[PDB]
Design a protein around this ligand. Structure first.
Ligand SMILES: [K+]
Ligand SMILES: [K+]
Ligand SMILES: [K+]
Ligand SMILES: [K+]
Ligand SMILES: [K+]
Ligand SMILES: [K+]
Ligand SMILES: [K+]
Ligand SMILES: [K+]
Ligand SMILES: [K+]
Ligand SMILES: [K+]
Ligand SMILES: [K+]
Ligand SMILES: [K+]
Ligand SMILES: [K+]
Ligand SMILES: [K+]
Ligand SMILES: [K+]
Ligand SMILES: [K+]
Ligand SMILES: [K+]
Ligand SMILES: [K+]
Ligand SMILES: [K+]
Ligand SMILES: [K+]
Ligand SMILES: [K+]
Ligand SMILES: [K+]
Ligand SMILES: [K+]
Ligand SMILES: [Mg+2]
Ligand SMILES: [Mg+2]
Length: 42
RNA sequence: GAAGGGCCGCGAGCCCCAGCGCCUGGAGGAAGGAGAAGUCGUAACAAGGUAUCCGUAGGUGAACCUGCGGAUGGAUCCCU
């Protein structure tokens, strides 16, 4: 339903920053096993 | 040449004032400890139901609450 020939959808770039409590509560990070804590893989 | 006397040198005793201990009375006031099985709440230990804890300031019956900066001994060793 656009009119512009060649129009593209604009994106968004937002950096989210949380504390530890909020991160765990909303599940951005999980409590891990003692072995698993040493893993830095994203 | 004795008693007796004068002035000083030595130096008791007492008085009087100040220091210096040590012990002790006291209306009230305010702590600590034990016997306790007495009221009132539930601050902490689990995310203890508002993560906990340090410094500081103020406030509330009580534990405690709140603001400003800090720490993990956290409930996160992990992402243009
Ligand atoms: K936190
Ligand atoms: K006294
Ligand atoms: K008793
Ligand atoms: K508390
Ligand atoms: K409370
Ligand atoms: K509480
Ligand atoms: K807290
Ligand atoms: K805690
Ligand atoms: K706190
Ligand atoms: K404080
Ligand atoms: K204050
Ligand atoms: K207050
Ligand atoms: K209060
Ligand atoms: K309080
Ligand atoms: K308060
Ligand atoms: K508080
Ligand atoms: K506090
Ligand atoms: K308050
Ligand atoms: K307040
Ligand atoms: K505070
Ligand atoms: K400030
Ligand atoms: K501190
Ligand atoms: K420690
Ligand atoms: Mg608590
Ligand atoms: Mg809590």
């Amino acid at each position: 339903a656009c009119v512009i020939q060649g129009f593209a959808i604009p994106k968004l770039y937002n950096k989210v920053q949380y504390c530890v409590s909020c991160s765990i509560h909303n599940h951005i990070v999980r409590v891990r096993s003692r072995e698993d804590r040493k893993i830095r893989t994203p």
